[PDB]
Design a protein around this ligand. Structure first.
Ligand code: HEM
Length: 399
């Protein structure tokens, strides 16, 4: 049994193991950091099964749960939020914050998302790059998702820049364990204050709705509100930043597609669709433990055994996506859903928001800066460590 998680084949590539497993051993056993074994599922059909099977559980206090790191094991001892719950607890809590993320709500949010992207690009423009390249991540990829989610949660304008910086430190590879920890705790402290304030005088934001609708009636605790708001903040922010950066790098690697996007920004949606399939930046979130024996493919997963369903592998499944390792914005999509945002009940709550943010970015970035260009050779791009989810640390650009 090979150690898991696997390391990416290279900066922008997925681990090489998946393709081989998909073809010769679709459902196999892998060894986790602590020596325990878990079932790794690599085929699209099987990943979808694992994502929806009612015989599987997300509760981390169940023995056999596939925790992939030492810290993951510690985090499992805390009170869980809906991300780690099974029905009926799962939807009872998720329903408390879903309103802001429905397709209709996100469609009505389009002007705000556009306004936010326009303002950040303009700030980038007025500043220029006369003295050299600027980091596309720091100046644009980071603040876009950050400002939007913070604002949606209820954070006031003047506090955005500081909080955006602190949340980054949380996951920055350069941060020491202490720095990452301090910033993490500091965001929780700030959220605790916001809850207290909104409990007194609510505003038109997420935290206020939790206070008024759930905390006040005693449905949930104040700390619960803080944790739910915290989950919404840290669940996909770093991912959104990485996706924007990977999107720019990808367009640079395939000039003809960039030329097409520039000529027709209406292709932004399909470009985003392919980007979320090709670059599965959150590939270790579909995990479970079997509550009872369950058959998957030619294997039997016994009760109390853990399962890791790779949506990244599923998104490169030849049986579902023709020429899967080819980035093609004009891809002819099959009836099967690409799984960049998961599947089933637990499917990313912000899928519509995330796509709207990415679609807005790629339907605007090159109109603002038609000559935007990565300021370093593409083969020198600073990607996230190979033993981590795919992403980009920084991206020097000129325009
Ligand atoms: C491009 C960006 C994003 C990607 C690729 C992404 C991907 C995912 C994936 C793969 C999962 C696992 C779903 C499953 O269990 O099947 C997930 C869960 C989740 N995501 Fe996202 N996400 C992104 C952005 C966001 C943002 C912006 C937020 C916050 C507003 C967010 C909040 C969540 C939450 C709360 C869950 C847990 C849902 C549940 O378990 O019920 N995501 N996301």
């Amino acid at each position: 049994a090979p150690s898991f998680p696997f390391s990416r084949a290279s900066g922008p590539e997925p681990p090489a193991e998946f393709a081989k497993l998909r073809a010769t051993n679709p459902v196999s056993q892998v060894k986790l950091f602590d020596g325990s074994l878990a079932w790794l599922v690599t085929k699209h059909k099987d990943v979808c099964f694992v994502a929806t099977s009612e015989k599987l559980s997300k509760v981390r206090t169940r023995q056999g749960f596939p925790e992939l790191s030492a810290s993951g094991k510690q985090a499992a001892k805390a009170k869980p939020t809906f991300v780690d719950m099974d029905p009926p607890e799962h939807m009872h809590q998720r329903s408390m914050v879903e309103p802001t993320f429905t397709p209709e709500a996100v469609k009505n949010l389009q002007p705000y998302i556009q306004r936010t992207v326009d303002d950040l690009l303009e700030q980038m423009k007025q500043k220029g790059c006369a003295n050299g390249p600027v980091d596309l991540v720091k100046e644009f990829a980071l603040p876009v998702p950050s400002y939007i989610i913070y604002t949606l949660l209820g954070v006031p304008f003047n506090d955005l820049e500081y909080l955006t910086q602190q949340n980054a430190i949380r996951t920055n590879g350069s941060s020491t364990a202490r720095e990452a920890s301090a910033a993490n705790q500091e965001l929780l402290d700030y959220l605790a204050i916001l809850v207290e304030q909104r409990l007194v005088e609510p505003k038109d934001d997420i935290i206020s709705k939790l206070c008024t609708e759930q905390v006040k009636p005693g449905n949930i605790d104040k700390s619960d509100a803080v944790q739910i708001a915290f989950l919404l903040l840290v669940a996909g922010n770093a991912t959104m930043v990485n996706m924007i950066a990977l999107g720019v790098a990808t367009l640079a690697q395939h000039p003809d597609q960039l030329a097409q996007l520039k000529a027709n920004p209406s292709l932004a949606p399909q470009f985003v669709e392919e980007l979320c399939r090709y670059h599965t930046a959150t590939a270790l979130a579909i995990k479970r433990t079997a509550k009872e024996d369950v058959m998957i493919g030619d294997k039997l997963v016994r009760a109390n055994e853990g399962i890791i369903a790779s949506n990244q592998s599923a998104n490169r499944d030849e049986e579902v996506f023709e020429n899967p390792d080819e980035f093609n914005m004009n891809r002819k999509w099959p009836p099967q859903d690409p799984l960049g945002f998961g599947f089933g009940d637990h499917r990313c709550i912000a899928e519509h928001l995330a796509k709207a943010e990415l679609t807005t970015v790629f339907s605007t970035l090159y109109q603002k800066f038609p000559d935007l260009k990565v300021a370093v050779p593409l083969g020198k791009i600073n990607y996230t460590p190979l033993n981590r989810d795919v992403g980009i640390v920084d991206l020097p650009v000129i325009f």
